[PDB]
Design a protein around this ligand. Structure first.
Ligand SMILES: [Mg+2]
Ligand SMILES: [Mg+2]
Lengths: 48, 158, 149
């Protein structure tokens, strides 16, 4: 299992000291995985 | 105390005695101011179907002979005590649960009723369950309960 | 002892705490009622009352109204009486800028750092009673409010 994409999760609190929300963002989903594959690997889990 | 009601039901509003005198006038087909076998056996038969059981003699034996207007009024007067109109019960039911939605859960209902206060048996409390219509999933509505406790609503009709 | 008025108050509390049988009294129940009936000191009096640190059976912790009365006297001899000067000085030491800008977090911290703690719903409940804003009080109002029962 490979985490093949960067991510950044920001969790929002309040001045009172309680959670209020969250915000995430991803960086550069690896491409060219559907096109020709190296030996003994698979493109993605969704297709399975 | 004595609970004899020496006065003619003075500890109540007087509107109900105009309704009671209207009831007395409509039952008294003889209109002599006194009930009778002639009176009830046909006025009760107006909505009834000529019952075979002799319970109108039950009334005339509960109070011997034909009963006066005041006698009827006082034998109802002894039947009212320690009760109040719908307003106070509605206000109390609004008080005990803040939501006031009348979602009196069965466990919550029994806990609030049978346990604290004047101790009495949950088995006799069950008369409020086998007869009074409780709402499903445990909660118990009160507005219909208050109406049926008062004269506003009745479970069934003859 | 006073006149029978205090005995009457204890009797009406006895019939008030009548759950699971009026006759038997739980030490938790008696402690709660004695505290509320004008006796603050309740923390370490379990050993001074029972004489036995046994606190394992919640269902049957034997106490009766008869011996309950001298217990109230030997508690009410007022073994400890503090006054607000020590309390306010401790809080002002606990205070940060002398006015109480935002006291909400640190009071919770100081109450959760104490070993002998029991409740959190009261910790969130203390907001009621003029303790509404972000620790706006300089503790004088809350000391006055708590010292009124
Ligand atoms: Mg990874
Ligand atoms: Mg007649």
């Amino acid at each position: 299992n490979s985490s093949r994409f960067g991510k950044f999760i920001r969790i929002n609190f309040d001045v009172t000291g309680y959670i209020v929300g969250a915000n995430i963002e991803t960086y550069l989903l690896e491409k060219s995985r559907a096109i020709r594959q190296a030996k003994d690997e698979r493109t993605f889990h969704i297709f399975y | 105390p004595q609970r004899a009601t020496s006065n003619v039901f003075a500890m109540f509003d007087q509107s109900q005695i105009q309704e009671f005198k209207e009831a007395f006038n409509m039952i008294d087909q003889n209109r002599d101011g006194f009930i009778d076998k002639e009176d009830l056996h046909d006025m009760l038969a107006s909505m009834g179907k000529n019952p075979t059981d002799e319970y109108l003699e039950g009334m005339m034996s509960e109070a011997p002979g034909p009963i006066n207007f005041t006698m009827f009024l006082t034998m109802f007067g002894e039947k009212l005590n320690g009760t109040d109109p719908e307003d106070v019960i509605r206000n109390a039911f609004a008080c005990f649960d803040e939501e006031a939605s009348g979602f009196i859960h069965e466990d919550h209902l029994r806990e609030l009723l049978t346990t604290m206060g004047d101790r009495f048996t949950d088995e006799e409390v069950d008369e409020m369950y086998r007869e009074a219509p409780i709402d499903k999933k445990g909660n118990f509505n009160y507005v219909e309960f208050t109406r049926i406790l008062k004269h506003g609503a009745k479970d069934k009709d003859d | 002892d006073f006149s029978e008025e205090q005995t009457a108050e204890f009797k009406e509390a006895f019939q008030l705490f009548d759950r699971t049988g009026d006759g038997k009294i739980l030490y938790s129940q008696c402690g709660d009622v004695m505290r509320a009936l004008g006796q603050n000191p309740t923390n370490a009096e379990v050993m001074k009352v029972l004489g036995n640190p046994k606190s394992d059976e919640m269902n049957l912790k034997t106490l009766k109204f008869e011996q309950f009365l001298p217990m109230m006297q030997t508690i009410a001899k007022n073994k400890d009486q503090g006054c607000f000067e020590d309390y306010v000085e401790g809080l002002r030491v606990f205070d940060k800028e002398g006015n109480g800008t935002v006291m909400g977090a640190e009071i919770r911290h100081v109450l959760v750092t104490l070993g002998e703690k029991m409740t959190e719903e009261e910790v969130e409940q203390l907001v009621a009673g003029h303790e509404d804003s972000n620790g706006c009080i300089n503790y004088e109002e809350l000391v006055r409010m708590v010292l009124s029962g």
